[PDB]
Amino acid sequence: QNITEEFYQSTCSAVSKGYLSALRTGWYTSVITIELSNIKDAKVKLIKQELDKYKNAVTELQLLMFLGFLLGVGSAIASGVAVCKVLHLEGEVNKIKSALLSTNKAVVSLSNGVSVLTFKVLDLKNYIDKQLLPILCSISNIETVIEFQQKNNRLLEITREFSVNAGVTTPVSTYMLTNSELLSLINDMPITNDQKKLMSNNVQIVRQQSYSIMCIIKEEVLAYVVQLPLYGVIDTPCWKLHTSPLCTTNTKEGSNICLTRTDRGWYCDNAGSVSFFPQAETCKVQSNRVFCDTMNSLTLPSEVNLCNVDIFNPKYDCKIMTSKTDVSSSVITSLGAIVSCYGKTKCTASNKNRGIIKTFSNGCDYVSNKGVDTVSVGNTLYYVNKQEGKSLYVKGEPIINFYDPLVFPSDEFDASISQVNEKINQSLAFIRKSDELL
Amino acid sequence: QNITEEFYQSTCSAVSKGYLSALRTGWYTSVITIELSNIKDAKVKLIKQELDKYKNAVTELQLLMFLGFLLGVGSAIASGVAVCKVLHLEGEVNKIKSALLSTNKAVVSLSNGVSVLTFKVLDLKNYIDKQLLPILCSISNIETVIEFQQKNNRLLEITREFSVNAGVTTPVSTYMLTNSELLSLINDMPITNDQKKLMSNNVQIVRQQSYSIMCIIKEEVLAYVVQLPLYGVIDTPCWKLHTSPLCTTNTKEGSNICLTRTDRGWYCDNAGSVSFFPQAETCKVQSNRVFCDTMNSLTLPSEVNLCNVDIFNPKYDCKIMTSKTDVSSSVITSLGAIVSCYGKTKCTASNKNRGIIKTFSNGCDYVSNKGVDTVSVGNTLYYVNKQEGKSLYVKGEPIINFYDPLVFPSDEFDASISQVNEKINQSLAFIRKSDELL
């Protein structure tokens, strides 16, 4: 949709809103089939070399056969591997062969009751048996050598990808599945029209989240399984949280306390809850659409958003980390940059036509991308994203100023607001209890 | 062999046994040689274009020339790079050329006393000198153009691969080493017959654990070093540990304490000790065989297994982490799934033909893969592995219930049973001394 950003000066955090979900929640498994042939002058020597390459590919394929620690562990290709085992049962390959005899695309019901889409993408049995067997040994035209090289290339390329990936490839390349084949596969999938438009317009994201699993060679048939993403939760509001360390600004080195919100990442509305994605590789952004894998996700109540408006709210306990290392850095957000400037570091913001526009004082600040192209923090230069959008600065007193440094716990990696206050309970009690006894 | 799994309810952990070891403990370096030439109508125009591509490739190659923090740091290609320096000494290249004059494979003794297998995989010197120099300018047949393209293509593919990898590639592709060449290298390696069968039947794993190091172009010979894995510890028992957070189930949001075993990973018996592999990328599982790199491993006493049958045993101190973040997740094991369900999260297990067959209550539980295809934890759906095997559920009272929440240390990232217990000692003593004083 339309992207907006809100920076919170109290907690040195920014939220960018206006995004839309495409959440991978399930898998669809399809069987891709290549039909093979069983084979028992300079142009003849060229065909012999290409035939040996084809036979070696068949033999080579036969011989083959902050908060990320809170996530669970899944098996990404379990659904595809399960279908591969089903294909090893007696008669399963024959059923797929009989279904694809007169057509290149069919829906086949397996023994376990699952119906899968079957595609025959390459027919090397027909070309070798019909256009290459009667002639072969006197070749009269160089055309058949080149035409055989063109046909056999895809098989060799597929074998090359499987042999260097131990039979499991991701992303799914165009040798495994062409754009025409993938779009045809999407149009016949048991999904809604909304899912079909989302996949057809974003096939490059679909490829990046799909798997190709080499399965079996049996009865002159090569088969591999393409595991395609199912985007079950779509077009729901999503927002990204950016956080930077918030420290005190005492001139003496080593005398400053710091805290950082550790819940940075992608958040998506999902039924009546929120999907949280702490890691950055797990989510792909295509224009306004955020493609996040639910496998690398945490399910949280909708009250997690209360930390952005009030870090001290009683409904939700906001995750923080504390330290005494006040180093300078910058976080590039969707529509601006958060600058954390501490110590003697020089922090500035510039644009290409006018030079330095802003010089940052010690602390944590923010600039929009409207008049800024670059941010310099010490020795590193950052380019800001030039995406269109509206930014809002929300003034507030940094919450690091509410803490007494003498009793501040500054060695917490995975703490929260309540946990930090719990340690402040106890430390103040020791001085309070001892004073009464003394 | 036969895979079995045992789930322990007390510590919320599962062990899958029955695996067999293939541990990479060493390296073997081999030298792979391509002979080059010293060279310099529409058909002649095509030959000149291919010849320029060969010369540019030569010029381009000449211009080129939880517990993972406890691991050590190695140099993976140190052995291969050391051989490369040896080949730069005077007379070393000529020795390899002389040994490969009448044969494509030989064992060559270097200056430093090391013997290495040397392989000539491409001979572009003879083709260019004999089949292409005399005809050089009237070409009468298109066959020589196509035949030249096929021979020079492998050199171009090797150059392209080395150019985007700074001269070091992993995995080793079939352009650097074909399947027939790699099997030939394995058969001549100074290894036992058992090692030869293991490498020959798992060449795809061998490729993923080998390096190709561009070495030298000198005196019309191109040489690169392929560093092959040496699997010295073979066929010993291996097992995998899966752990999940174990929390109390009080209805108040932030009143619960959690602990998780942090020693998840692979374990293999090794000459009276145990090799522990905390990380997941470091170990590749091909059927029943586990291919683990000893570089990313710790050596532990055999008593580390005592933590699986008794986490409170005095012989070994089991590593744990504690917190107050009771989030829901699932861990997919070899033969089932561990489900940690906390708060208001909905957790179910189901199969495709019958629907939801189990609803999880609060706590952490386990389900086998015999009647289960999928597991849902909140908004996340997990497919379970469908591998055949026997699962055992070991009933036991969760050990999180043995801890007094008032004195529980709930901020330990790399603790152990003793460290947690020793911290409980101090807090309990502090109130005990004060009570006695009062």
């Epitope: 839309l20 909304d194 079950g232 939760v233 509001p237 509305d269 999902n270 | -």
Partner: antibody
């Protein structure tokens, strides 16, 4: 408790127009796809139209395509149908329905339904 | 054909098990879409009693089972009760219609 209600349906002449309004109260309206389902008196259910959670995706049955236009306002938690060029075949009780928040889930939240009558 | 075929009426004595069939085509069930089941009283809105061919919503008694096989689906009600007297609808997603196809409806009479 979800309170999904409809309003704005009555008696129109053939070729006339109506605008149905459906207002939701007790759930995160912006995270659900909304539908219209109609039931002619004495017959079964017929799916009319759908709109995704943020309005990107809109679908119509062929029987109402080119004459009905679904819309929503997430600020007001409202659904609209905006019927035009109505015929006698359009007489039915119209339900606005909410699914389970995922793509192929069943309708689990229904309005009470409002009757639309087209006659001369 | 964007059509689901359902028996017009089913009757059963109290305490017996009745079955309601839902026959689909290659556009809806032959494609691989699941079947959901709805129970509607004469004056009220439909209420879902089964989804994903066998999954029971909260508050639905275990008497409703359901199953899918091939291109047809069935809904079974063991131990028929007077409260089960309603019209039952099966629906599926249909790829040709580009939306939801509902069944004709089966009036279940408790004798």
């Amino acid at each position: 408790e979800v309170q999904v209600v409809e309003s704005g349906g009555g008696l129109v002449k053939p070729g006339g127009s109506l605008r149905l309004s459906c207002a939701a109260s007790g759930f995160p309206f912006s995270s659900y796809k909304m539908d219209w389902v109609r039931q002619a008196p004495g017959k079964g259910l017929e799916w009319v139209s759908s709109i995704s959670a943020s309005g990107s995706y809109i679908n119509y049955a062929d029987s109402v395509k080119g004459r009905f236009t679904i819309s929503r306002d997430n600020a007001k938690n409202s659904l609209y149908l905006q019927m035009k060029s109505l015929r006698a075949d359009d007489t039915a009780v119209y339900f606005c329905a909410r699914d389970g928040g995922r793509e192929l889930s069943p309708f689990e939240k229904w309005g009470q339904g409002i009757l639309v009558t087209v006659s001369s | 054909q964007s059509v689901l075929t359902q028996p017009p009426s089913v009757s059963g004595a109290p305490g017996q098990r009745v079955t309601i069939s839902c026959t689909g085509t290659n556009s809806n069930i032959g494609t691989g879409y699941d079947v959901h089941w709805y129970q509607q009283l004469p004056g009220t809105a439909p209420k879902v009693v089964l989804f994903d061919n066998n999954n029971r919503p909260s508050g639905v008694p275990d008497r409703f089972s359901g199953s899918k096989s091939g291109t047809s689906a069935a809904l079974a009600i063991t131990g028929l009760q007077a409260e089960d007297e309603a019209v039952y609808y099966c629906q599926s997603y249909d790829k040709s219609l580009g939306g939801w196809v509902f069944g004709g409806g089966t009036k279940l009479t408790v004798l």
